[PDB]
């Protein structure tokens, strides 16, 4: 079992925090917020680094390029923005979604950005030019998450419509659809670091580890509260192999990935823990919470 202990509470956003992501190089934490701002913090000392601004509505997601130099953000203003981290300048504005942009990610080579939107589409964008290369008619309801696999050849998307879909990046064709016979809305999805599995949250308080090729549910994680919001979940791999997720009871939940037992709950947030992130090399978790809380917490474990 891990022993995550609180190290820092990061205050400064004036509305709900929506998303936190560690830079691939481990130096930085980026956070997006309903307050329209991105904030950059030191990953190891919690020190505020800078504020990046320009979205004229709130931001639901943010993501790092693989070389840690760029960020992409997704906003209620229907655009994504590509930012140069060092300068804080907006390098591109990605236009073409017709409703809120909900989620975003670079591919590993970081020449592409994938976005999902309330307009029910998944868009694939060229980073260099800001051009939209593809609009995928992905879902029949808002798209809650989009994620590339380890080589960028696959995209996984999830939606309130209840489906998890796997797309061939190059052709844009849907390779696989996962269904649950029930339609719980699917609120989050990502590939496992190896790309063999998909981790899917549904709004029935349930996380599931899937083999997408086989189409089998391997693992179920429960005990947390998730019925209303799209909460990020994570594979923790730097120490023990955990599943990490926020929860609507204001706790961070940590499960043993293989046994599915809950191994730790992190207490201290005072609103829904909407987002968690796992540091790439250290046993460090970042968590962030909604309007009653507005803070980010950094937690450290010996394993």
């Amino acid at each position: 079992k891990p022993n995550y202990a609180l190290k820092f509470t990061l205050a400064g956003h004036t509305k709900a925090v929506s998303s936190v992501k560690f830079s691939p190089n481990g130096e930085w934490l980026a956070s997006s917020s309903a307050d329209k701002l991105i904030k950059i913090w030191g990953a190891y000392d919690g020190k505020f680094e800078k504020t990046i601004s320009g979205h004229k509505l709130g931001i639901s997601d943010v993501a790092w390029s693989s070389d840690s130099n760029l960020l992409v953000s997704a906003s209620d203003d229907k655009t994504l923005k590509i930012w140069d981290v060092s300068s804080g300048k907006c390098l591109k504005t990605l236009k073409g979604h017709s409703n809120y942009v909900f989620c975003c990610n670079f591919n590993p080579q970081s020449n592409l950005i994938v976005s999902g939107s309330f307009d029910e589409s998944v868009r694939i964008w060229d980073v260099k030019t800001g051009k939209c290369l593809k609009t995928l008619p992905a879902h029949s309801d808002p798209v809650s998450a989009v994620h590339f696999n380890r080589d960028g050849s696959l995209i996984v998307s999830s939606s309130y419509d209840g489906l998890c879909r796997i797309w061939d990046t190059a052709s844009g064709q849907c390779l696989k659809t996962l269904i649950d016979d029930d339609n719980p809305p699917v609120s989050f999805v990502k590939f496992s670091p190896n790309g063999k599995y998909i981790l899917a949250a549904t709004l029935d308080n349930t996380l599931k580890l899937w083999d997408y090729s086989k189409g089998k549910c391997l693992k179920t994680y429960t005990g947390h509260k998730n019925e209303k919001y799209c909460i990020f979940a994570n594979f923790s791999v730097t120490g023990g192999k955990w599943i990490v997720s926020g929860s609507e009871d204001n706790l961070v939940y940590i499960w043993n990935l293989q046994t599915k037992e809950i191994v730790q709950k992190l207490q201290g947030h005072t609103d829904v823990v909407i987002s968690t992130a796992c540091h790439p090399t250290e046993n460090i978790i970042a968590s962030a919470a909604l309007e009653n809380d507005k803070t980010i917490k950094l937690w450290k474990s010996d394993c």
């Binding site: 509305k15 709900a16 929506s18 917020s33």
Partner: peptide, 9 residues
Amino acid sequence: GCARSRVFY
């Protein structure tokens, strides 16, 4: 606010 901090759809 932002879409993710509001109750999903």
